UniProtKB/Swiss-Prot annotation, chain C:
Name recorded for this polypeptide: 3C-like proteinase nsp5
Lineage top rank: taxon: Viruses
Organism of provenance: Severe acute respiratory syndrome coronavirus 2 (2019-nCoV)
Chain ranges of the Peptidase C30 domain: 1-302
Modulation of this protein's activity: Inhibited by pyridone-containing alpha-ketoamides compounds 13a and 13b. In turn, alpha-ketoamide 13b (tert-butyl (1-((S)-1-(((S)-4-(benzylamino)-3,4-dioxo-1-((S)-2-oxopyrrolidin-3-yl)butan-2-yl)amino)-3-cyclopropyl-1-oxopropan-2-yl)-2-oxo-1,2-dihydropyridin-3-yl)carbamate) inhibits SARS-CoV-2 replication in human lung cells. Inhibited ex vivo by michael acceptor inhibitor N3. Inhibited ex vivo by compound 11a and 11b.
Reactions that this protein is recorded to catalyse: TSAVLQ-|-SGFRK-NH2 and SGVTFQ-|-GKFKK the two peptides corresponding to the two self-cleavage sites of the SARS 3C-like proteinase are the two most reactive peptide substrates. The enzyme exhibits a strong preference for substrates containing Gln at P1 position and Leu at P2 position
UniProt-annotated location(s): Host cytoplasm; Host Golgi apparatus; Host nucleus
Length: 303, 10, 302, 11
């Protein structure tokens, strides 16, 4: 029993984190085989962080301008290039701890584990969802750029996020590992703002199923709704529309609990219309949308 | 507001 | 910015998890130098769980009755002993990935990271506080016994918790790494119940300070309270009494924010008496008590 | 109910 925000074990990623320094600018890099990946913001100077021309900045650098450190072991840079908002620094040593991995671009609503790092040293691990407005609600300070988000399948690490920046509302923006930003954001300190966000409906339903699996049943009712009538209510409360594909992904959960998806949508509707009346679900007085259906199965089945 | 690039100082 | 329930990186602990099996009973063990530590419940059978005599069960076993696996590599047990509720299995191979470590016994109100494991394999990592009634609100299924809770300082792992059991309310009970239970619990499937729990006041205050450091200020007020008047309200809402020791450990957070501890206690009092009126603090509609003052500082800017 | 010792079963 129990249901927690649970990260993947971070060991395989800790062994890939390095420190990258250019002048007085430092951040984290990801060391896979003989390539270190890091945000190109490391070549930005403190005086021109507003309008950097990174192509210019990069031409003016040489390999020896990049200080890469795996702990105390200094890694010599022997080649450099820029792909979108990430730098690829070729080093003379392949990381002997490189895991099986892939670079993937995740969709809004999917979750991943963040290994927050400073000066190349892992400091903490937590779960995040990619919000519909393409930000994440992380916990990041100066020096955290280059920390990565990932999922693990068997022993294969899927890197999906590299951290770059913080937006004015205190949420976080970054790229995939090919350097393409999630969301309409850019790696410079100009005026930028997160778009309006929405709640991930399929995840709230997943978490209601988790709640039932853990014995919370007070929010169930004998009613059912149509998908169209539910989406009518969802729009009113700024929830993403629920699609037939979402209903299908919730199948294993409905099957295990015996609660049809549209029966649970009737519970969600009542919770949206009336609130919780002082009760809690899995320890929360708010409807939680940062667990996917997959996250619930992983934790309630213990994979 | 402006974005903050969260590199650090050495 | 931001404030999340953040676990320590689990790498140094993952390399210590093994699988221990006796007959058809399996659970997890912790492999440090040439010793594997695990719950003694592994020597029980499905029939000896209501009132087992573990001294008896252990004399009836030999080294070869314990199958220890570090992945697929089988570890040969060359000695066994029982310390309180844990077994120590001496093995022929010292763990080459043993971190600098110590065993510590934590107090109620302190937090730690749990590496949940099944069959010797890590499955996830999360933060947990030791509740005032000595349970933890974990996430544990059958097979998770032997998973450990830990804190990391520099490169030193302080192991503080080994998982044993789930109580009828769905909360979790275990031992320190010397095998002594936290709380008045025993490793038998008898009727046992967590005592009444309370809210960790010093942690709620730490977390209000985190909220201020992150820009939530709506709950502040111009009032201050006495420690005595605050504790009358804490008693009414089932919060632990706040001591001068707690006021002192909030010192750095109070200095950084410029909000005196007893000024923040007047905020907490108002929040207890009136609620949040539809507002949230750091993304929560409830007052959060699972962050220590140390957890706030570690994670927040200064 | 009673406490549950959360060992697992194997083969």
């Amino acid at each position: 029993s129990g249901f927690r925000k649970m990260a993947f074990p971070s060991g395989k990623v800790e062994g890939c984190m390095v420190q990258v320094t250019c002048g007085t600018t430092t951040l984290n890099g990801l060391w896979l085989d003989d390539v270190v990946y890091c945000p190109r913001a490391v070549i930005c100077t403190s005086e021109d962080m507003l309008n950097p021309n990174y192509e210019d900045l990069l031409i003016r650098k040489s390999n020896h301008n990049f200080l890469v450190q795996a702990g105390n072991v200094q890694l010599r840079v022997i080649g450099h290039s820029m792909q979108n908002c990430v730098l690829k620094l070729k080093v003379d040593t392949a990381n002997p701890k490189t895991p099986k991995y892939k670079f993937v671009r995740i969709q809004p609503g999917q979750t991943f584990s963040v290994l927050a790092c400073y000066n190349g040293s892992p400091s903490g691990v937590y779960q995040c969802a990619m919000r519909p407005n393409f930000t994440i609600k992380g916990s990041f300070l100066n020096g955290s750029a280059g920390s990565v988000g990932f999922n693990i399948d068997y022993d294969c690490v899927s890197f999906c996020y590299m951290h770059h920046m913080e937006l004015p509302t205190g949420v976080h923006a970054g790229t995939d590992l090919e350097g393409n930003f999630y969301g309409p954001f850019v790696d410079r300190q100009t005026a930028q703002a997160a778009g309006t966000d929405t709640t991930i409906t399929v995840n709230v339903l997943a978490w209601l199923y988790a709640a039932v699996i853990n014995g919370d049943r007070w929010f169930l009712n004998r009613f059912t709704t149509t998908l169209n009538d539910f989406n009518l209510v969802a729009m009113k409360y700024n929830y993403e529309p629920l699609t037939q594909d979402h209903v299908d992904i919730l199948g294993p959960l409905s099957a295990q609990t015996g609660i049809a998806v549209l029966d649970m949508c009737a519970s969600l509707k009542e919770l949206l219309q009336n609130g919780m009346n002082g009760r809690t679900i899995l320890g929360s007085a708010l409807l939680e949308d940062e667990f996917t259906p997959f996250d619930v199965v992983r934790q309630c089945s213990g994979v | 507001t402006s974005a903050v690039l969260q590199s650090g100082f050495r």
